[PDB]
């Protein structure tokens, strides 16, 4: 009988990084997206596998909500059936993806005078990540050419790289808050509807 905590996800005080994203499940509520779908407050509302209007008359048993902040030009890697550095090593969306991707500019908060270096991303791994799987490790990956085997030196790098924001950066380098809400159906009765 109570509205779903979609506003809580939208208005989170802080956002997780791409390698440490937080999954918040939605249940035991009903969501009314009519006021926000036409609000035009989101610069990107891609809904792969489902029409935005049609999902109103449907009930989803489980909802997965993910949040992370990336570059303005880095949202290409977040797409079903897409190969990229972020998809391979940070966050992979499976082909059977039925969620709605919502993103908007965050120049007001994420970008500020003095610079922001809190965010991180990963680029070094053995193979690509399995979709909907997140791994956090401090192991220092080493290139096969010169193995240090105990330290981070020549041909040995730490997977994490510091990631920066500042107002003087261009539109392509601007921060963008990205929230993905996935919906699935099961034989169990659905506690979430539209």
């Amino acid at each position: 009988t109570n509205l779903c905590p979609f506003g809580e996800v939208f208005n989170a005080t802080r956002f997780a990084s791409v390698y440490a994203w937080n999954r918040k499940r939605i249940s035991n509520c009903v969501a009314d997206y009519s006021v926000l779908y036409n609000s035009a407050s989101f610069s990107t509302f891609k809904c792969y596998g489902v029409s935005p209007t049609k999902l109103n008359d449907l009930c989803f048993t489980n909802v997965y909500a993910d949040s992370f902040v990336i570059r303005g030009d880095e949202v290409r890697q977040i797409a079903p059936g897409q190969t990229g550095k972020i998809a391979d090593y940070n966050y992979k969306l499976p082909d059977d993806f039925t969620g709605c991707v919502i993103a908007w500019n965050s120049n007001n908060l994420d970008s500020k005078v003095g610079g922001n270096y809190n965010y991180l991303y990963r680029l070094f791994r053995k193979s690509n990540l399995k979709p909907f799987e997140r791994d956090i490790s401090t192991e220092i990956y080493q290139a096969g050419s010169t193995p240090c085997n105990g330290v981070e030196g020549f041909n040995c790098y730490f997977p994490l790289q510091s990631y920066g924001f500042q107002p003087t950066n261009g539109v392509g380098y601007q921060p963008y808050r990205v929230v993905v809400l996935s919906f699935e159906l099961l034989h169990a009765p659905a506690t979430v509807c539209g």
Epitope: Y117, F158, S162
Partner: nanobody
Framework: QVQLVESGGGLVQAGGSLRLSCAVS??????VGWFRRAPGKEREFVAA????????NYLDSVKGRFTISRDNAKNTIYLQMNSLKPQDTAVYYC????????????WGQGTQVTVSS
């Protein structure tokens, strides 16, 4: 490799936790960690500090973690040199991630300490 000044020099007393400090230019999102060498050798790892201000790597010699400082406004990187190992006297330079990709270079100076008791 324009201007990355450092500081050092001392032979007063060994056995304690005498510190060493330097400074670096505007780094932004750059990882920094000092390196030292050994006689008849080179490229010995010491530590690595991230640009977040919370990511820190420590040597096998130092047990767990020690005191390290980093001021983003002043752009200074500090090192943990506790226990003042008697044989650990060498040249210290505040080299950046020249081996890595998104850090240009730094190999331009070096400081030494020769404290003894």
């Amino acid at each position: 490799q324009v201007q990355l000044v450092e500081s050092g020099g001392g032979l007063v007393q060994a056995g304690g936790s005498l510190r060493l400090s330097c400074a670096v230019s505007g780094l932004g999102a750059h990882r920094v960690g000092w390196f030292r060498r050994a006689p008849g050798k080179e490229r010995e790892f010491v530590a690595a500090i991230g640009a977040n201000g919370g990511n820190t790597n420590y040597l096998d010699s130092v047990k767990g973690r020690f005191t390290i400082s980093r001021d983003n406004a002043k752009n200074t990187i500090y090192l943990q040199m506790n226990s003042l190992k008697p044989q650990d006297t060498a040249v210290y330079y505040c080299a950046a991630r020249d081996i890595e990709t998104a850090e240009y270079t730094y190999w331009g100076q070096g400081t030494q300490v020769t404290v003894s008791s």
